[PDB]
Nucleic acid binder design. Structure first.
Lengths: 129, 155, 106, 204, 168
RNA sequence: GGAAAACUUAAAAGAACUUUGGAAAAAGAGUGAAAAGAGCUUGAAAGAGUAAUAUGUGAACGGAUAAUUUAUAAGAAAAAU
RNA sequence: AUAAACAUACUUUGAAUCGGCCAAGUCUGGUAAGCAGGACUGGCGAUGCGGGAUGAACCGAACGUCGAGAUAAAGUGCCAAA
RNA sequence: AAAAUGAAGACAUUUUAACGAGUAAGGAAACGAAAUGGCGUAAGGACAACAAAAGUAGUAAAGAUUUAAAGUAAUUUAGAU
């Protein structure tokens, strides 16, 4: 079973004048200028993050596969969601070596847990292997 | 300084390179644009005509104040010049790459100038004494040039 | 082979002087000159059939369609409102659409 | 489908402004228009009345460079095009595409002289005008401001009128013969079965 | 007994914890996906609860025009309504129209005033069994004067026939 | 009165012979785990060059909505009695 | 009579602010001013949205993100929905 | 805001109703039905494979360039080089 995840705005809330100037990054900042076009909510430029854009409480932080991400660092950390395999999905951290990744991947198959980094740090077996 | 690109088949290519060459970038950038893609024998003929002012080098991008000439008809550029120093430097690199090709055993009559790129290099400063007790900068514009010749084959 | 449709002109979107709502498209059906002839067409099918010049290496069809339904009259001149599965591209303004004879009520 | 055929409007006995408004809307609806005899349109006001308006129009001109300034076309076909272009969207692809499907001519050129001519009832001069109100043909106004080819058109139209006179006379002869032949078939006994069906629905 | 969330699977000699049982006493179970029941098969005579109500114009023996689908514009004769699907069992007599025996949904036809009637059509078969028999399935995953001319021709909208004014 | 300037590698093993060039250098060759090649750990942004892709009438950039193209991406179970 | 329990009465601590401007079925000085100064109220400042082509103040109406409808000021020859 | 439930679930519980514009300015931390909720930088004390070898790391850390995912947002997560 999987609910219908509905997003009220799929774009990105870019910073004001971030397109014209390279010193101004795209991370959002509220314009506090007294004469700011965006803060005053003119026509055309009236797009600000507001709490009304929040997604449904039921389907928040849910990956498109329908499960919630759960980071794991070793095989023992998988046992904390071994009883919730229908709600959580494993996620091997970015610093786990390739050797320890094999143990996590082969253990999660035993415990029937979905892993999202199952194709990470694979050896050269891509062409002629 | 590494090369911008690598040849598809290292067995059928030759390379030549010059670093910190004491020649103007803007002149050599436009010259190297003209000889890109033509055969080695044709390029050597073209570069020799440029020296004696018999074929133009169209200054397509850096054309601020460049005069117009009668040889710039058909190139979609109204401006061109005859950079002698930059043409000579490329002629020495084209010759060097050819000798590299011959040592490899390639056929000179089949080679083309497939890849040729010019990059900016570190400048050298000098003093220009201006009025009212001022000094300015009198800076050179050297460049690196990379040349790669490959045989032409049907695809 | 035979004509089982009436040509309708994609006039534009339901709009105001300085706004525009591309959810509702406005159509002018050929032969409907007043709002009293609109009730027959309320609920019929409308298709925007367009041609795309695909390449030999693609299996995508060269002929595609966008379907919708005529939902309500618009003004006293026989203009109608239609809602489509995907909003009509404004590049298709002034083009011809098909008004079918189904879902029938006769 | 696709509207490939061309709507031909006979601009004779019409009003310049009201023709343009109807044509401008339908140009945006994807139709293709060709307005022939764009010189025979009518406008309100006498010749002196129209000349005063023209001289005011001629005043507008870029002071520092008249070549950049407003261009005052004098050919009546270009007086209609200006009127239509004013009722179309400006500075977008929709406006330019709509105007691309419009042509005026001062007469009936070769391809459009044998095409079905239409009329715009809202723009007819016999409906919108008091008969006592004085009008001005666009051809007559064009001559007063410097349109050189007014008499060339008057020559070309004259030969078209006489050429259409003999074609119509021959067609009226054939049509009368075909009409009387059909009467004999209708009155014929062998076609009795087919005639009654037409008479039942009033066609016969 | 095992916890409801514990579905043991076999380990290909891979390292296993102490608590996880060895594969010798672990038996695989085929993955189950379907959870809904198919439609029940009732008597051939009795009609389904999901039966559409035909329009008053569509009566047996009437002549209909198919305005959508493969046989768009063809003219067919209506025999009776399929009680197991609500569709119309029409035959655009094959020797005239070329339209075979088929089922068409009632919303894609126009019930013309012209009626041919014809009782004693002998419709003993022609039901859910027959149409299901002559359906081409996939290969699965793991495996009256002038009436003849009227019907023989397509129905098309000439110039000047606006559908809101058309009565058939 | 009064600055600036830290870092090759584990170890110089800091290329060493041939061809082209007046020479500087380049191309092979070799050392090294790896050129990390002495302007030497990593190597951002501003600025350029090359390659691929796309667009075009007196500014350019942004947003809503679709269309085209590309990319990503959802399955192995299985009916009635 | 009508309304009022997230009513009512507050207590303590403290921020910013006291350059203002506009409208008018208002007034004073001035020939008059998009001038100077006042009484009452509503606004702009602090305020976007729809309309008046454009406009700090005019008219409707004040704003979480959206869908569908009935509307307001005001409009329905084309630009422009009618 | 008011009812109901409440040692641990979890999404900072469940239900119903009203509400949500805003410059200057204010709402420190903690407070189970929480007297606003959070993101990020660096350092110090702890915790981090519960069965006596107990977070990650040469089977590739930090960093850099991008591709995608989560979050209204600050930002976070993961893949590739």
């Amino acid at each position: 079973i999987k609910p219908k995840i509905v997003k009220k705005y799929t774009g990105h809330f870019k910073r004001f004048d971030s397109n014209r100037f390279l010193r101004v990054k795209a991370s959002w900042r509220v314009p506090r200028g007294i004469d700011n076009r965006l803060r005053r909510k003119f026509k055309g430029t009236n797009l600000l993050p507001k709490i009304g854009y929040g997604s449904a409480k039921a389907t928040r932080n849910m990956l498109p596969c329908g499960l919630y991400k759960f980071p794991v660092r070793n095989t023992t950390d998988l046992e904390m969601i071994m009883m919730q395999n229908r709600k959580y999905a494993a996620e091997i951290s970015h610093a786990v070596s390739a050797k320890k990744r094999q143990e996590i991947i082969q253990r999660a198959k035993i415990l029937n847990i979905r892993v999202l980094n199952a194709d990470a740090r694979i050896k050269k077996q891509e062409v002629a292997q | 300084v590494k090369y911008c690109a690598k040849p598809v088949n290292v067995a059928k290519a030759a390379q030549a390179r010059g670093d910190n060459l004491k020649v103007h970038f803007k002149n050599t950038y436009e010259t190297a644009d003209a000889i890109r893609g033509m055969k080695v024998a044709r390029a050597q003929e073209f570069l020799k005509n440029v020296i004696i002012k018999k074929e133009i080098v169209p200054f397509r991008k850096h054309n601020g104040g460049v005069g117009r000439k009668a040889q710039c008809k058909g190139l979609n550029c109204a401006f061109g010049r005859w950079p002698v120093k930059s043409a000579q430097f490329i002629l020495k690199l084209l010759k060097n790459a050819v000798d590299n090709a011959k040592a490899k055993g390639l056929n000179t009559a089949l080679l083309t100038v497939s890849h040729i790129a010019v990059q900016e290099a570190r400048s050298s400063r000098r003093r220009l004494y201006r009025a009212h007790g001022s000094i300015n900068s009198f800076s050179s514009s050297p460049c690196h040039i990379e040349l790669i010749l490959t045989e032409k084959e049907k695809k | 082979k035979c004509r089982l449709h009436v040509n309708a002109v994609f006039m534009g979107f339901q709009r105001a002087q300085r706004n525009q709502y591309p959810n509702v498209a406005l159509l002018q059906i050929s032969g409907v000159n007043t709002k009293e002839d609109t009730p027959f067409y309320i609920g019929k099918r409308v298709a925007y059939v367009y041609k795309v010049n695909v390449k030999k290496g693609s299996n995508k069809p060269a002929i595609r369609a966008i379907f919708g339904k005529i939902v309500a009259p618009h003004g006293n001149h026989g203009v109608v409102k239609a809602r489509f599965l995907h909003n009509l591209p404004p590049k298709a303004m002034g083009q011809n659409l098909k008004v079918f004879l189904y879902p029938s009520n006769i | 489908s696709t509207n490939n055929k061309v709507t031909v409007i006979d601009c004779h006995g019409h009003v310049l402004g009201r023709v343009a408004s109807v044509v401008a809307k339908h140009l945006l609806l994807g139709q293709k228009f060709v307005l022939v005899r764009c010189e025979d349109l009518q406008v309100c006001g006498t010749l002196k009345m129209r000349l005063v308006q023209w001289e005011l129009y001629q005043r507008k001109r870029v002071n520092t460079n008249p070549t950049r300034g407003a261009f005052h076309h004098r050919s009546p076909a270009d007086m209609v095009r200006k009127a239509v272009r004013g009722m179309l969207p400006k500075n977008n692809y929709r406006g330019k595409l709509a105007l691309k499907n419009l042509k005026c001519f001062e007469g009936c050129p070769a391809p459009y002289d044998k095409m079905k001519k239409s009329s715009i009832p809202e723009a007819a001069a016999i409906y919108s005008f008091n008969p006592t109100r004085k009008r001005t043909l666009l051809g007559e106004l064009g001559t007063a401001v410097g349109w050189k080819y007014a008499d060339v058109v008057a020559k070309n139209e004259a030969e078209r009128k006489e050429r259409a006179a003999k074609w119509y006379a021959a067609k009226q002869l054939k049509q009368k013969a075909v009409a009387e032949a059909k009467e004999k078939i209708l009155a014929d006994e062998k076609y009795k079965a087919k005639v009654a069906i037409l008479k039942k629905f009033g066609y016969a | 007994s095992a916890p409801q969330w514990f579905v043991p699977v076999k380990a290909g000699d891979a390292k296993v914890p102490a608590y996880y049982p060895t594969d010798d006493m672990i038996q695989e179970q085929k993955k189950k996906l379907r959870t809904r029941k198919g439609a029940k098969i009732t008597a051939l005579d009795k009609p389904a609860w999901n039966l559409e109500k035909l329009r008053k114009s569509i009566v047996p023996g009437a002549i209909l025009i198919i305005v959508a689908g493969k046989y768009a514009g063809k003219k067919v004769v209506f025999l009776k309504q399929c009680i197991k699907s609500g569709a119309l069992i029409v035959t655009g007599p094959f020797k005239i129209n070329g339209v075979p025996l088929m089922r068409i949904n009632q919303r894609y036809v126009i019930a013309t005033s012209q009626k041919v009637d014809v009782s004693k059509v002998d419709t003993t078969g022609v039901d859910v069994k027959f149409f299901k028999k002559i359906a081409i399935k996939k290969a699965a995953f793991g495996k009256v004067p002038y009436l003849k001319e009227y019907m023989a021709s397509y129905f098309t909208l000439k110039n000047g026939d606006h559908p809101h004014l058309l009565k058939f």
